[PDB]
Design an enzyme around this catalytic site. Structure first.
Site, PDB file in Angstrom:
ATOM      1  N   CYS A   1      -5.892   4.879   6.057  1.00 41.16           N
ATOM      2  CA  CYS A   1      -5.702   3.742   5.041  1.00 41.16           C
ATOM      3  C   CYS A   1      -6.961   2.910   4.710  1.00 41.16           C
ATOM      4  CB  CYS A   1      -4.719   2.912   5.697  1.00 41.16           C
ATOM      5  SG  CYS A   1      -4.066   1.604   4.444  1.00 41.16           S
TER       6      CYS A   1
ATOM      7  N   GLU B   1       0.840  -1.046  -0.094  1.00 38.49           N
ATOM      8  CA  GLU B   1       0.242  -0.051   0.018  1.00 38.49           C
ATOM      9  C   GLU B   1       0.853   1.155   0.032  1.00 38.49           C
ATOM     10  OE1 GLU B   1      -0.560   2.825   1.663  1.00 38.49           O
ATOM     11  OE2 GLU B   1      -2.059   3.488   0.616  1.00 38.49           O
TER      12      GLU B   1
ATOM     13  N   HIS C   1      -7.962   2.044  11.954  1.00 39.18           N
ATOM     14  CA  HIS C   1      -7.950   3.377  12.468  1.00 39.18           C
ATOM     15  C   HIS C   1      -9.322   4.015  13.146  1.00 39.18           C
ATOM     16  CE1 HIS C   1      -3.747   3.963  11.126  1.00 39.18           C
ATOM     17  NE2 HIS C   1      -4.346   3.378  10.094  1.00 39.18           N
TER      18      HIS C   1
ATOM     19  N   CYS D   1       2.568  -0.684   4.821  1.00 41.44           N
ATOM     20  CA  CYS D   1       1.578   0.114   4.339  1.00 41.44           C
ATOM     21  C   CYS D   1       2.121   1.761   4.288  1.00 41.44           C
ATOM     22  CB  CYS D   1       0.391  -0.009   5.022  1.00 41.44           C
ATOM     23  SG  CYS D   1      -1.143   0.955   4.611  1.00 41.44           S
TER      24      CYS D   1
ATOM     25  N   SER E   1       3.374   0.177  10.915  1.00 41.07           N
ATOM     26  CA  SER E   1       4.232   0.430   9.759  1.00 41.07           C
ATOM     27  C   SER E   1       5.346   1.868   9.995  1.00 41.07           C
ATOM     28  CB  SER E   1       3.590   0.679   8.283  1.00 41.07           C
ATOM     29  OG  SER E   1       3.289  -0.646   7.923  1.00 41.07           O
TER      30      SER E   1
ATOM     31  N   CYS F   1      -0.537   4.421   5.998  1.00 40.51           N
ATOM     32  CA  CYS F   1      -0.532   3.975   7.426  1.00 40.51           C
ATOM     33  C   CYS F   1       0.679   4.782   8.232  1.00 40.51           C
ATOM     34  CB  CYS F   1      -0.496   2.524   7.581  1.00 40.51           C
ATOM     35  SG  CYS F   1      -2.133   1.998   7.884  1.00 40.51           S
TER      36      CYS F   1
ATOM     37  N   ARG G   1      -0.835  -5.221  10.700  1.00 42.98           N
ATOM     38  CA  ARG G   1       0.341  -5.131  10.800  1.00 42.98           C
ATOM     39  C   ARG G   1       1.005  -4.964  11.668  1.00 42.98           C
ATOM     40  NH1 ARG G   1      -2.477  -3.955   6.480  1.00 42.98           N
ATOM     41  NH2 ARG G   1      -1.772  -4.739   4.447  1.00 42.98           N
TER      42      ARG G   1
ATOM     43  N   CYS H   1      -5.855  -1.518   5.297  1.00 42.59           N
ATOM     44  CA  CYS H   1      -6.258  -1.614   6.757  1.00 42.59           C
ATOM     45  C   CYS H   1      -7.394  -0.921   7.379  1.00 42.59           C
ATOM     46  CB  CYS H   1      -5.144  -1.552   7.875  1.00 42.59           C
ATOM     47  SG  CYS H   1      -4.293   0.128   7.731  1.00 42.59           S
TER      48      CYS H   1
HETATM   49  N1  FCO Z   1      -2.643  -3.047   9.788  1.00 43.24           N
HETATM   50  C1  FCO Z   1      -2.564  -1.923   9.319  1.00 43.24           C
HETATM   51 FE1  FCO Z   1      -2.197  -0.275   8.705  1.00 43.24          FE
HETATM   52  C2  FCO Z   1      -0.520  -0.394   9.013  1.00 43.24           C
HETATM   53  N2  FCO Z   1       0.679  -0.296   9.309  1.00 43.24           N
HETATM   54  C3  FCO Z   1      -2.689   0.376  10.466  1.00 43.24           C
HETATM   55  O1  FCO Z   1      -2.926   0.456  11.558  1.00 43.24           O
HETATM   56 NI    NI Z   2      -2.793   0.490   6.027  1.00 42.65          NI
END
Ligand code: FCO
Ligand code: NI
Ligand code: SF4
Ligand code: SF4
Ligand code: SF4
Ligand code: SF4
Ligand code: FCO
Ligand code: F3S
Ligand code: F3S
Ligand SMILES: [Mg+2]
Ligand SMILES: [Mg+2]
Ligand code: NI
Lengths: 551, 268, 267, 551
Positions: free
Chosen positions: D60, D13, D67, D545, D501, D548, D478, D63
């Protein structure tokens, strides 16, 4: 010598009783009896012609769509309305998708358990079963692991002690001939069929508004509003959705259903030499593609005395030869008027007086064509197509024959199609050919909308005086269907349905001639008269629908 | 593990109510019969026929006395002592009364069994009546529609099994989750109704913009159901009105099969 | 031969690409193997780095005047484009170059269509719409955060099957998907009209599926097909049907600007 | 010393650049750089706390859900709200189903093409490929006929000359080690994965209102109205629909994804000895099941210096040790304030000055835990579970190990999990364990509603004066995610996200220590510096990602 009754016959639509005299272990004479009546012809009388289709659709939910389409065609015939071509394509898609559902459910859920022994499947080696199908099918779900998983479902069901719908079946019966492996394959395919039939009905639903019992027809066309740029109507997104389900049908039909048909023939080859129901066959052309209720994709015709070479073609739903030939009698049926009646002058006056072998024994009427008994349905339909030299149908039959030959080293000739297995083969061929009908008619719809034609409905006018007669023909899953409407002073003054199972299941006629179910049973060997499996094999091959037959 | 028993009897049925199960996804008919219930009697699907299937019914009525769900589709014809529907040489009303004696719950699936439906319409040639009329001493749960969305039935059965009792019912003994509100009191075309935006004929300009179908005879204003919300076939956006055709009132006694397609509904 | 598509991500969350994984007609596998040739898409490409930039240049030359350009995300103009840099160059330069030989240009999602969440509040990166960076071009806008993927796929299918875009409204949105207010085709309208409103999540009215206006439903000022087409093709799934008001994610000045519980203006 | 740049890194991503110094065909130093910023922390400032989740969900779409959930948890933490247990079960189901989708897409659509050679699949014998999986998987779609059909899709794509997304891949690269048969299997599984991931997202959609970007949360609980007897709300029919999709996930996950993970380890065993990113690992507990934001189904903890036996457990999202340890630095990031900041006092002031090897080279901040670099994600998560003696996790690991042993005759020990393949293994284990989370939480929801509890939402009050702070933790796909909200005079005065990430991809920190991506690359062999496939193998194992990481 012995008298038996099969009541109820299961794995059909509706209420059927079969009686047989057995002499020296062979059926010598039989009686078919529809044991339930509703009077749908009477219920729809005296209503606006436009209202009929919604009521008469309820003749049957198994062959849903068929009575609905035949009713609007009848009204359109009386009123002399030319249906817009987009409405034809939509009607055709619905009928073709529906019939695909219907034939699949028939072969697997209704018929398979006459030929297949689920307890024997428990003894199968899943790996051998899979190995048996190499070079016979390219189907992606014939692995040993798939079969092992199905075998384990059967095993769990048997261990539970609650067999339910499989309880007290004909497990171990002498007429059950499949090896364990082939029984296991059939059960896996039985379960896989249920996914394919669901996809077919998703096509129906997206055009019909639901299924069972579609709700998108009208005298004059359809209620689907075509507008590629419209929100909430039949736009390009909705068309793409429909197409996605059309495309999912073909593989199961070709690689499973077609192949299983050939396999069952290979193991039961004697069933190609019994179950002949008649010598005359009738089908109507289906799937009109012009703007004047014609240019049919499938041809029709009449075959007399099994002579394909001198058959009479029928290319039009207003064919006066077809129309004039059709009558029904109630001599051995529970109605008052017994003389053969043309359906525009038909009556349906109940006159139940109990069962009598030589008198009245059924709620089903006895239809004739110029005084003769006729078989309708997929066998009639296939033979008519072969008579017309339809290459598509010859080629599809040949694919089935080739598989049968690979398994047995023998061929099939046309004489052997006049049988229980021939009937089943015709049905399968029909289902295979319908997949091209779907592709063709979807493409025709898309192309036509792209040319700027979004018309779907011609608003009818119905004169307030005068008397007008209409007839709506349709080649239903079980055969030639006709609805006959007389309009007088703006309302339905007579309504008669002559339904394909009426043709096949009808009792002895005005001249005491024997109809297809009853004729097909003569000569059937019966190993155990308490468990007459051989009798229901033959009856099931006709795909009986008694709600249809009697209405 | 043992599955709850079900006995399904067809009376004056078109078989549409059984066929609806073949469209279901939660559960699918294969999961229904292998995992959710034990379907002990159902004439459309039974391997057994004739004397063998009648054996299965008698064994089941005795073995599961006080425990099975009885389901009936079709109306029950009373005219001329029940002869308009005869199974194994006896009137269907007698089979139904016998099976009703030991039922834990009784369900009328479809408008025919729920209130007479199409089979009792017009002159009622066979004296067709509802399941509740033939079983006056019992609480019949009514799941109307011609046919209903199968999940209106399957979620009713699931409630009985999972929580030990029926779902809440309205005063016609219909489950409130599926029949608790008029179609017109939860129809996505209501904004067009309110604005005077109506289709006048199929294929006209308003119709092709998805306007309200009131003037084509939509019976949503006098029909209870979940057709606008639950819809049909689980594909998204499929019910009669969404396809372009008015509601006919098939759920509702005195509307479906009695009023003409194009006859206007009364609005409250 | 399948019609070519070049997909460029700018200030994207990747939700517009992810929506394709929920599609059923076509499914993403049928999309990329049967319907189109997806010539550049960074999320799915086997190639990376210099190899994937080779694939883009080859495709822009080979299919000049024939490809559909798709852009998701807003384009940041502040400080000369440095808030989104691919292969050492501002994304706005990649997009302008690819726009030169495009047969059709599609802004998928509210970010590319009108700035979206990335341009909300103080707009820290000077995020703007695809149409703003391509003033000489007709940009087709498919808003939503993310839109139903078929709002995009049926637009592409129209271009391929009939050779032209679908009918568009005056914001260049396809009329089949954005031609009407959500509130002018919402199944809870009867409850709105009767004064039957949910006042709080979990209250009695909410648990009877009453209208969500008083929880801040922005249906009355949002164009879309969320009440009819809905989401995920399972039946009955959109925010209001689940019990939450429309937030106006399709519509500039509503989504990401107005509070969830702030009332909409009713026309 | 040779210098390479990988820009863009694909099959992740978002926007990532990786630079490497290579000495004698071995990576000696690397730089990870997030090249796109939006300022989502700034965009959400000065809004009502209730509004944040809808905005920050857009950090994001890969994912999605994460959030959103972390944001409401943060507000609920600040406001001291106990979430009703039905809302927890619904939140848990969504997170678990989402993560199932996400891990499957990661293994197949994002990662597989690093390890799998499509053109080599064209040389495969489909029958041998199928035969290779006997006694390894019971999956029902590993037949020669399935593989032949997939092979023919690849063949048609290659013959068309429009390879699209497969064009110019690393076909024939020396690091590609699978035989032809195994490449063909992987591609079939790649296509089959897309069906499973769709089913997982149907679960998410039925509770969330759509996906990507759910719309059923609230500060205080969820917006799903629970009423078993209600029309148009979350009733028993809707719950049964949800359950039908939950039940479709397990077989692919167990019989395909889990098995493929073992198989790839067997053919690439050197990848168990490289790609170590850190010696410290962190995860938070997940899936609360009580009425007070606790009783987690999955445990959390902190592992220091790879020592599982002395790990520190974390059983609460209010753990002051966890909270106090977290800081972020921007010394080598494009922001102004460089000293390590606790996120409640964090700033995000952009200060782009171009790339510099020893200065600023990324939009990603550098997070530390009491001054140390930490790996988060499925590896951290698995090792923490093993450290806690969670039998479920040990058993699932052992199933993978058993398949690997059957193929190689070797075992895997814990030391080998601190690797590229170990990371991938942790992800797979996570996905398998989530299937029991789904079953458990669905049953808990059903049971609880049956006890008479239909509550879903506690309406918050937010004081108009005062300042207070909340933090919302979540174990995302992640790794450990945290959102940090300061409320002042009724509005958000500060909002900081520290995203998994961010932990892994963050550049060199305030003390110039190297974070996980950059550390994992040291020692990577690179056969062809123009085509650094070995580098993206390692990077992809972290499931980057960048939307993220940077937000
Ligand atoms: N899983 C995911 Fe996205 C990332 N890094 C978030 O929180
Ligand atoms: Ni993400
Ligand atoms: S209610 Fe309708 S679908 Fe059901 S049995 Fe009666 S006529 Fe058939
Ligand atoms: S009349 Fe029918 S179409 Fe119009 S709003 Fe009412 S229910 Fe909907
Ligand atoms: S419009 Fe929404 S879902 Fe689409 S790229 Fe912008 S943030 Fe993501
Ligand atoms: S305010 Fe929202 S929920 Fe209410 S009728 Fe309008 S769009 Fe529907
Ligand atoms: N097919 C079908 Fe039903 C019958 N017979 C009709 O028409
Ligand atoms: S006709 Fe029947 S199926 Fe629903 S839309 Fe009307 S109640
Ligand atoms: S929030 Fe967005 S998805 Fe539709 S319901 Fe409102 S426009
Ligand atoms: Mg008749
Ligand atoms: Mg941050
Ligand atoms: Ni029928």
């Amino acid at each position: 010598s012995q008298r038996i009754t099969i009541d109820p016959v299961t794995r059909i639509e509706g209420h059927l009783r079969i009686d047989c005299e057995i002499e020296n272990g062979v059926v010598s004479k039989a009686w078919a009896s529809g044991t339930m009546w509703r009077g749908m012809e009477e219920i729809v009388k005296n209503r606006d012609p436009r209202d009929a289709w919604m009521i008469v659709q309820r003749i049957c939910g198994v062959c849903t769509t068929t009575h609905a389409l035949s009713s609007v065609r009848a009204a359109e015939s009386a009123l002399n309305i030319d249906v817009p071509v987009n409405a034809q394509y939509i009607r055709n898609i619905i009928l073709a998708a529906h019939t695909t559902h219907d034939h699949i459910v028939h072969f697997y859920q209704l018929s398979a358990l006459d030929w297949v022994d689920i307890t024997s499947a428990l003894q199968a080696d899943p790996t051998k079963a899979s190995e048996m199908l190499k070079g016979v099918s390219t189907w992606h779900l014939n692995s040993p692991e798939e079969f092992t998983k199905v075998q384990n479902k059967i095993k769990d069901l048997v261990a539970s002690g609650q067999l339910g719908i499989f309880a007290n079946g004909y497990w171990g019966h002498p007429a059950m001939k499949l090896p364990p492996e082939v029984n296991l394959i059939a059960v896996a395919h039985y379960l896989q069929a249920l996914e394919c039939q669901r996809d077919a009905n998703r096509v129906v639903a997206l055009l019909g508004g639901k299924t069972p019992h579609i709700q998108n027809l009208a005298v004059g066309g359809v209620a689907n509003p075509i507008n590629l740029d419209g929100l909430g109507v039949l736009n390009l997104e909705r068309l793409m959705y429909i197409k996605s389900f059309i495309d999912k049908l073909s593989d199961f039909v070709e690689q499973v259903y077609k192949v299983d048909t050939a396999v069952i023939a290979a193991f039961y080859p004697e069933w190609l030499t019994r179950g002949k129901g008649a010598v005359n066959y009738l089908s109507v052309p289906e799937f009109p593609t012009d703007s004047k209720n014609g240019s049919f994709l499938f041809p029709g015709g009449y075959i007399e005395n099994a002579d394909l070479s001198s058959y009479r073609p029928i290319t039009s739903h207003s064919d006066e030869y077809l129309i004039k030939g059709i009558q029904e009698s109630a001599k051995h049926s529970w109605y008052k008027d017994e003389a053969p009646q043309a359906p525009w002058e038909g009556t349906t006056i109940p006159a139940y007086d109990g069962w009598s072998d030589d008198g009245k024994y059924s709620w089903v009427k006895s239809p004739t064509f110029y005084g003769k008994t006729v078989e309708v349905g997929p066998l009639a339909n296939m033979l008519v197509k072969l008579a017309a030299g339809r290459e598509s149908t010859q080629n599809k039959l040949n694919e089935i024959v080739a598989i049968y030959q690979k398994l047995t080293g023998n061929t099939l000739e046309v004489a052997q199609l006049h049988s229980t297995l021939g009937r089943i083969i015709g049905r399968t061929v029909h289902c295979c050919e319908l997949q091209d009908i779907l592709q063709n008619q979807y493409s025709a719809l898309i192309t036509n909308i792209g040319k700027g034609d979004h018309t779907t409905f011609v608003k009818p006018n119905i004169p307030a005086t005068g008397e007008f007669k209409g007839v709506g023909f349709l080649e239903a899953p079980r055969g030639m269907l006709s609805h006959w409407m007389v309009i007088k002073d703006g309302i339905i003054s007579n309504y008669q349905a002559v339904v394909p199972s009426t043709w096949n299941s009808g009792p002895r006629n005005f001249n005491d001639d024997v109809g297809p179910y009853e004729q097909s049973l003569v000569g059937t060997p019966v190993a155990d008269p308490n468990k007459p499996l051989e009798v229901v094999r033959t009856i099931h091959s006709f795909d009986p629908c008694m709600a249809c037959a009697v209405h | 593990p043992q599955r709850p028993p079900v006995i399904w009897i067809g009376a004056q049925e078109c078989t549409g109510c059984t066929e609806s199960l073949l469209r279901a996804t939660h559960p699918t008919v294969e999961n229904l019969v292998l995992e959710t219930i034990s379907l002990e009697y159902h004439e459309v699907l039974s391997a057994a026929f004739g004397h063998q299937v009648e054996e299965n019914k008698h064994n089941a009525l005795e073995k599961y006395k006080g425990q099975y769900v009885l389901v009936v589709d079709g109306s029950i014809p009373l005219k001329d002592n029940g002869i308009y529907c005869m199974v194994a040489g006896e009137p269907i009303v007698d089979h139904i009364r016998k099976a009703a004696e030991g039922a834990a719950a009784i369900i009328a699936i479809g408008s025919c069994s729920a209130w007479g439906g199409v089979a009792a319409a017009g002159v009622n040639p066979t004296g067709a009546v509802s399941l509740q009329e033939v079983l006056p001493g019992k609480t019949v749960i009514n799941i109307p529609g011609c046919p209903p969305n199968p999940h209106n039935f399957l979620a009713t059965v699931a409630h009985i099994i999972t929580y030990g009792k029926p779902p809440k019912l309205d005063d016609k003994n219909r489950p409130t989750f599926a029949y608790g509100r008029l179609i017109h009191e939860h129809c996505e075309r209501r904004p067009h109704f309110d604005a005077g935006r109506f289709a006048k004929e199929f294929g006209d300009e308003g119709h092709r913009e998805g306007w309200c179908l009131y003037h084509l005879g939509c019976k949503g204003p006098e029909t209870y159901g979940n057709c606008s919300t639950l819809q049909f076939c689980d594909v998204g956006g499929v019910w009669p009105v969404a396809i372009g055709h008015p509601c006919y009132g098939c759920n509702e006694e005195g509307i479906g099969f009695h009023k003409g397609i194009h006859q206007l509904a009364n609005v409250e």
